[PDB]
Design a protein around this ligand. Structure first.
Ligand SMILES: Nc1ncnc2c1ncn2[C@@H]1O[C@H](COP(=O)(O)OP(=O)(O)OP(=O)(O)O)[C@@H](O)[C@H]1O
Ligand SMILES: Nc1ncnc2c1ncn2[C@@H]1O[C@H](COP(=O)(O)OP(=O)(O)OP(=O)(O)O)[C@@H](O)[C@H]1O
Ligand SMILES: Nc1ncnc2c1ncn2[C@@H]1O[C@H](COP(=O)(O)OP(=O)(O)OP(=O)(O)O)[C@@H](O)[C@H]1O
Ligand SMILES: Nc1ncnc2c1ncn2[C@@H]1O[C@H](COP(=O)(O)OP(=O)(O)OP(=O)(O)O)[C@@H](O)[C@H]1O
Ligand SMILES: [Mg+2]
Ligand SMILES: [Mg+2]
Ligand SMILES: [Mg+2]
Ligand SMILES: [Mg+2]
Lengths: 257, 257, 257, 257
DNA sequence: TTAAAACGTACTATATAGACA
DNA sequence: TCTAATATCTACGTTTTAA
């Protein structure tokens, strides 16, 4: 059924080429080329994870005849309170090696071997605040002993964690600030979402003054809020047999925040 | 419906470029250029807040890609009995940073860190008389360690607070006094309100010298009285089916003060 | 461009060798030789901080290869409500050490260890009235257990704090008073500013009675008022296109105080 | 392409004969002659690891007939929370003995066996604060049982760790303080970096008053920051087809710190 | 079986830092 | 005046290994 297909589409996710994504990718290309360790910092739901995820797809593994893959970018998200072994597990699994059970030292040695062997040059650690204090020493050694740019991605909680150890603070001084949407950039973003994400049979004109006021108030400039509001409002409108987001459906969703 | 929209327009606030606002804005430009700390003082409802608010909107943040915003002017109104962590939290949140739970020393260092880098050069503290005596020492250190023109705004209750601390009084001697207004510029201001603010379909002729008399007696030269009387007179007159504000309604309002 | 460069200079700070600075330095040199604790007291904006900075800058940290630096004079300004660890952190970070997380006892032992070996002989605590009552016991123990001249600096607020602990009062009772300027010294100080600080392209003649009499009334002999008035007056005169401070701008500034 | 060769060079590392490196090496020569155990302490990114690693390249293993190679200096960096087995493994592996599986007592006896006969006379343990308090007993026994100068290297955290064991503290009392760069030595280092490290087609004149202020603000005297900033600024400038680091690029890099 | 090495997480003993009366 | 809490700071001992 068309409705079930449209709900299945709007239910999911998609990547939109926002300008802050291009900013990050160009900045990560510099840091990867200079092989330079750094941090990406920005408040929650500003889009940091989707942007870093888009970067590893742009720099997918590359192949040579009869050789292991070169994997320039490794992207991992640690689990909460990540110790050394869980960091080493995360990295080696991303490189597609099922490391046989063993000591932390055995996991460390195998991780160094595959980080060298697969030609990894950038290691993005998303939610780096989830690392234990003892684990940043292993992250620093990967940065120092190998020619690898390590990127710590997090909120202002990461900035607070990093300040607790001079040796991490001084290795990750360079930062990019991921920011909220506002002003005309927000209005351009709303229009892109209508045309590219929602793709409803009839134009909703979300950029118009009253609609834009509702969205500005409810989203507060978070791209996470903008995406979740408009997708649910699109699903509610189509479930009611409407061909567009209507103002009443939008305010009804916006009133839940 | 006509009425509900215009009532909602009159129910909201507006800004008008009065000569007092223009005078303050030039004075603040001099102080910001010189990095001179100073105070703005004057009776309630003389328009100090609206003038200081308009100054930050005229000097809005500049964004550049992947950096924290360049924010030349920060404007804060402290909560009552503001301590130092409250003050630091206000400044960091204005600069679009989330505070992380920590000591006063941690909040201080994070605020000093982002007052740099965001490139702040003026800090306006509206109703500075809400500051605890201990937090004035952090205000003074922001003014002294960084190149920041701190502007204290308040009534004469601010002058009472700062005269009790020698070191605060001497740092904030330079001041501008907001005045109540009467006669010619008052007559112009009344005319400016009926021209630019009330926007009623039919002329109220508040320029009339007898209408100016009753407004002189009630508004007593306070712009915050003048605005509130005319706005209240508009809503009553429109709701009573009148195209106009006239003395029969205007003096019913004016007698209410 | 011309205007921005001279303004960016004039909004800065500069240190003029007043006789008030020399008498402090010759006094602190005698106190340092005797290792004698004492206090410097005087009204706000009399130049106490700038003179103590000048003394600290004449007695530089001396490097010796691979040794910790020999630092004869430490200068600290406590933050407000300075407790023992706050004091110890500021001392040990003035010497080129990081604090490690630890107890008050760990911070004390490390501070006493580095005040020795850095060879400290005078400690200046500027705005010593910010010290908590409890932390004066550690200040007294530094002055008693090591042969260190502790110099407390503040206004009459310091005498109000000190007199409430007779053990502190009786150790820091030797004092020096910073005065208001007056007379021929005030005339001589004004003469220096336009040629040693302002250096506008044309003479301002600030010594002339019609200027000198206004500056007397506006500054009252506070060196901080004298400096900040003339710097702002030069900046405003330049911004109007003038080669010099005119008395019209001098009156335009002096009326703001 | 020439650009890829220069970026590949600038992306790397090099050892500059800084005077503090010479100061350390002269000190380690005295301690190695005396077989005296000691510690090296200084802030993060001050160059301690580069200077220690440079020492064990001067004192590389010997080639000798019919006898195992004399290796005067062993250098190891423990992994985080290094226990004694991991200590012994790193020492034997540095001496190129592939020690098999065994008990800790086997690893101990085999380490003591190869520290003799290789004729080791100095052992440098970098990041010595990573040692468990139980493995410090084996370090002390290496220094006591054999005539070996053990050098413990770390930041101020190492001083705190050593304080917690009387028997370690009294064996490593002698120390060298590795320092930050400042003053004329910083200007000399920026000059040395442009000549010896960046080797760009045209002089960047980074020693100049304008550039030296930008570098001092960003570098704060940390050699680690100096090297990172200048190499990345070079790579940015060459990628833009400049022949040198322009101030516009240097400020653009420095704005990230 | 027999060291003995590696390693998840508990019932505790304190050492503060600071919103309020 | 007097707390919750975010740790520190060892131990609880319990698995895993290989010999
Ligand atoms: N580039 C994008 N294109 C489309 N949707 C996006 C994009 N960036 C963010 N979103 C939407 O915003 C949501 C939140 O983004 P994201 O997961 O990247 O946040 P984050 O900044 O990593 O947050 P947190 O710090 O809380 O983990 C996404 O799940 C998606 O709905
Ligand atoms: N320039 C202006 N343009 C339009 N309305 C104004 C202006 N100045 C004042 N008002 C009106 O007067 C009211 C009071 O002004 P404002 O809030 O600036 O006073 P204030 O001096 O900051 O007062 P207080 O000292 O009591 O806090 C405003 O909320 C608005 O209704
Ligand atoms: N010797 C000097 N040369 C030039 N300017 C000076 C000198 N002394 C004081 N000033 C000016 O006066 C200002 C105030 O001086 P300073 O900070 O030393 O005063 P203070 O007595 O320590 O004040 P407070 O007690 O308020 O902290 C300086 O920032 C500077 O503008
Ligand atoms: N002598 C040198 N010549 C060239 N570059 C140097 C030199 N010393 C330091 N560096 C640069 O500074 C960086 C930091 O130096 P190093 O690793 O030796 O610091 P560290 O003091 O051991 O730091 P930490 O205590 O944080 O581990 C180096 O990786 C290199 O980029
Ligand atoms: Mg995320
Ligand atoms: Mg107000
Ligand atoms: Mg002072
Ligand atoms: Mg190191």
């Amino acid at each position: 059924e068309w409705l079930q297909a449209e709900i299945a589409r709007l239910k999911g996710k998609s990547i939109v080429p926002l300008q802050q994504v291009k900013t990050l990718h160009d900045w990560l290309d510099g840091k990867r080329k200079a092989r330079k360790s750094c941090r990406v910092v920005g408040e929650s739901r500003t889009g940091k994870t989707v942007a870093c995820d888009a970067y590893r797809y742009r720099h997918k593994p590359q192949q040579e005849a009869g050789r292991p893959p070169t994997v320039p970018v490794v992207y991992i998200r640690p689990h909460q309170k990540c110790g050394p072994k869980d960091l080493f597990k995360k990295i080696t699994e991303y490189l597609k090696y099922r490391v046989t059970k063993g000591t932390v030292s055995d996991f460390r040695d195998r991780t160094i071997e595959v980080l060298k062997g697969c030609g990894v040059e950038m290691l993005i650690i998303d939610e780096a605040d989830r690392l234990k204090p003892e684990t940043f020493a292993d992250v620093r050694d990967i940065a120092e002993d190998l020619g690898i740019a390590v990127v710590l991605v997090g909120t202002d909680r990461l900035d607070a964690v990093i300040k607790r150890d001079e040796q991490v603070l001084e290795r990750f001084r360079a930062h990019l600030r991921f920011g909220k949407l506002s002003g005309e950039d927000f209005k351009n973003t709303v229009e892109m979402w209508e045309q590219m994400v929602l793709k409803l049979p009839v134009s909703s004109n979300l950029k118009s003054k009253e609609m834009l006021r509702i969205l500005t108030s409810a989203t507060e400039g978070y791209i996470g809020r903008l995406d979740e509001i408009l997708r649910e409002a699109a699903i509610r409108s189509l479930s009611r047999g409407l061909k567009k987001i209507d103002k009443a459906v939008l305010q009804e969703v916006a009133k839940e925040y």
